[PDB]
Amino acid sequence: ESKQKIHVGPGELDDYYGFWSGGHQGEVRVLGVPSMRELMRIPVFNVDSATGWGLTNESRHIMGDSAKFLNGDCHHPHISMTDGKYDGKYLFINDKANSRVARIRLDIMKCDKMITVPNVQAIHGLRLQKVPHTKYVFANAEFIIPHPNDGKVFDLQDENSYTMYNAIDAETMEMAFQVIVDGNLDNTDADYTGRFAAATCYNSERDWVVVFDIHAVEAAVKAGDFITLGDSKTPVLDGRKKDGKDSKFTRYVPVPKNPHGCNTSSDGKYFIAAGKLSPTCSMIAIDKLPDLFAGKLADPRDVIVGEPELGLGPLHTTFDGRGNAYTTLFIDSQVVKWNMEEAVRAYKGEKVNYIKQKLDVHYQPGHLHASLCETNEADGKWLVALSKFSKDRFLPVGPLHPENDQLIDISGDEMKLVHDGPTFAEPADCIMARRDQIKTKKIWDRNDPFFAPTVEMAKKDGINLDTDNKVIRDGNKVRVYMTSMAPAFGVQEFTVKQGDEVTVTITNIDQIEDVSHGFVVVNHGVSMEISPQQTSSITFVADKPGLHWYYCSWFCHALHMEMVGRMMVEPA
Closest CA to 197 of 209, 208, 183, 207: 209
Taking the complex as a whole, the smallest distance from the CB of residue 180 to Ca ion amounts, in Å, to 19
Strand ranges (E), 232-297:
236-238, 250-255, 262-264, 270-274, 281-285
218 or 405: CB nearest its own copies: 405
Report the site for Na ion in 40-79 (rule: CB under 5 A): none
Distance CA 311, CA 365 (A): 13
Tell me if 108 contacts its own copies by CB under 8 A: yes
Whether 379 contacts 369, CB under 8 Å: no
* Residue type at 235 in one-letter notation: P
Taking the complex as a whole, the smallest distance from the CB of residue 294 to Ca ion amounts, in Å, to 29
Taking the complex as a whole, the smallest distance from the CB of residue 531 to ligand CUA amounts, in Å, to 11
Distance CA 320, CA 568 (A): 62
Whether 163 contacts 143, CB under 8 Å: yes
Taking the complex as a whole, the smallest distance from the CB of residue 364 to Zn ion amounts, in Å, to 11
Q: Residue 282, Cβ neighbours under 10 Å: how many? A: 30
Distance CA 219, CA 226 (A): 11
* Residue type at 287 in one-letter notation: D
Tell me if 487 contacts its own copies by CB under 8 A: yes
Tell me if 268 contacts its own copies by CB under 8 A: no
The two beta strands, 175-181 and 236-238, are: parallel
Binding segment (CB under 8 A) for its own copies, from list 165-173, 190-198, 280-288, 526-534: 526-534
What helix, strand, coil percent values describe the chain, rounded to 5? 10, 45, 45
Provide the mask over 234-263, with x wherever binding to Cl ion is found by CB under 5 A and - wherever it is not: ---------------------------xx-
Distance CA 384, CA 432 (A): 9
Report the site for its own copies in 310-329 (rule: CB under 8 A): 313
108 or 355: CB nearest its own copies: 108
Tell me if 509 contacts ligand CUA by CB under 6 A: no
List the single partner that 555 binds among ligand CUA, Na ion, Cl ion, none, CB under 5 to 8 Å by kind: ligand CUA
Report the site for its own copies in 433-462 (rule: CB under 8 A): 435, 440-444
List the single partner that 149 binds among Ca ion, ligand CUA, its own copies, none, CB under 5 to 8 Å by kind: its own copies
Q: CA 227 from chain center: how many Å?
A: 29
Tell me if 514 contacts its own copies by CB under 8 A: yes
Tell me if 73 contacts its own copies by CB under 8 A: yes
Distance CA 537, CA 458 (A): 11
Taking the complex as a whole, the smallest distance from the CB of residue 393 to Cl ion amounts, in Å, to 24
To which H or E segment does residue 140 belong?
strand 136-141
Taking the complex as a whole, the smallest distance from the CB of residue 272 to its own copies amounts, in Å, to 18
1 or 231: CB nearest Na ion: 231
Beta bridge partners of 104: 91, 111
Tell me if 157 contacts its own copies by CB under 8 A: no
Binding segment (CB under 6 A) for ligand CUA, from list 348-356, 469-477, 498-506, 557-565: 557-565
59-77 b/e with 16+ CB inside 10 Å = b? bbbbbeebeebeebbbbbb
Question: Which one among 336, 486, 528, 567 touches ligand CUA, defined by CB under 6 A?
Answer: 486
Report the site for Na ion in 111-150 (rule: CB under 5 A): 115
Distance CA 45, CA 68 (A): 10
Provide the mask over 534-553, with x wherever binding to ligand CUA is found by CB under 6 A and - wherever it is not: ------------------x-
Q: Residue 526, Cβ neighbours under 10 Å: how many? A: 20
| Three-state secondary structure readout of 196-249 | EEEEEEECCCCEEEEEEEHHHHHHHHHHCCCECCCCCCCCEEECCCECCECCCC
Binding segment (CB under 5 A) for Zn ion, from list 54-62, 91-99, 362-370, 516-524: 362-370
Tell me if 75 contacts Zn ion by CB under 5 A: yes
Return residues touching Ca ion (CB under 5 A): 202, 207, 258
Return residues touching ligand CUA (CB under 6 A): 486-487, 517, 552, 554-557, 560, 563
Return residues touching Na ion (CB under 5 A): 115
